[PDB]
Design a protein around this ligand. Structure first.
Ligand SMILES: COC(=O)N[C@H](C(=O)N[C@H]1CCCCC/C=C\[C@@H]2C[C@@]2(C(=O)NS(=O)(=O)C2(C)CC2)NC(=O)[C@@H]2C[C@@H](Oc3nc4cc(OC)ccc4nc3C)CN2C1=O)C1CCCCC1
Ligand SMILES: [Zn+2]
Length: 197
């Protein structure tokens, strides 16, 4: 009871810059600063962009702002709070059946617009700033035009799938693996997010 620990907050440690003509990852906080920020829940670093790199004490993945909400996967964030300038912020969306959670998008971040193009030529943004062409194959599945080992997708859950116009189409959730090669991906449709809201 007196010994009972508390799980830490999710911490933004970087972002995927998509504003220029070349996408690249940027780190905003190191391991030591991340661990301390996770314990206190107070992150006073300025936030920028749409795709954040987030970390727990044991895991690192991505979070994407869509319509004023920072979305990520439940299997990464759990029910954890996210660190903010004023302290830990409680999740405003939690859906384990969709593998989806969400916080209020932090001040300074920019949001992606939900896609209404109905296009199936998608692009997956990974934590290493790779922009992978993906063809939509269903409501929540897509095939990589160039298959590659799952290692390249590890840590990219919560990242966006974009349409040709840059709209958000879904949130990267899982990789369909065949002998270690990711030929397909599963994602949370943007409409499923829009519903939850
Ligand atoms: C042939 O068999 C199969 O391949 N079958 C696959 C198949 O299972 N693949 C595996 C291959 C892993 C190996 C690495 C994959 C690489 C990248 C992957 C993008 C990422 C990712 O990056 N994570 S991460 O690194 O950021 C991390 C762990 C946060 C820090 N997702 C990812 O790792 C997924 C997490 C697990 O899945 C789910 N956990 C939960 C848990 C919940 O409460 C706790 C509630 C809902 C929920 N919902 C899931 C679908 C395993 N994950 C897979 O992707 C399909 C089968 C059909 C439906 C979906 C899964
Ligand atoms: Zn679109």
């Amino acid at each position: 009871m007196a010994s009972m620990k508390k799980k830490g907050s999710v911490v933004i440690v970087g972002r995927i810059n998509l504003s220029g003509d070349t996408a690249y990852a940027q780190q905003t906080r190191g391991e030591e600063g991340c661990q301390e920020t996770s314990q206190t829940g107070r992150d006073k670093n300025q936030v920028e962009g749409e795709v954040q790199i987030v970390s727990t004490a044991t895991q690192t993945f991505l979070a994407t702002s869509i319509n004023g909400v920072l979305w990520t996967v439940y299997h990464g964030a759990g029910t954890r709070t996210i660190a903010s300038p004023k302290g830990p912020v409680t999740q405003m969306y939690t859906n384990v059946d969709k593998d989806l959670v969400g916080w209020q998008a932090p001040q300074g971040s920019r949001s992606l617009t939900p896609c209404t193009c109905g296009s199936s030529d998608l692009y997956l943004v990974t934590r290493h700033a790779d922009v992978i062409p993906v063809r939509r194959r269903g409501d929540s599945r897509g095939s990589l035009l160039s298959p590659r080992p799952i290692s390249y997708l590890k840590g990219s859950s919560g990242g966006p799938l974009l349409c040709p116009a840059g709209h958000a189409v879904g949130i990267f959730r899982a990789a369909v693996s065949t002998r270690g090669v990711a030929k397909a991906v599963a994602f949370i449709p943007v409409e499923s997010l829009e519903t939850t809201m």
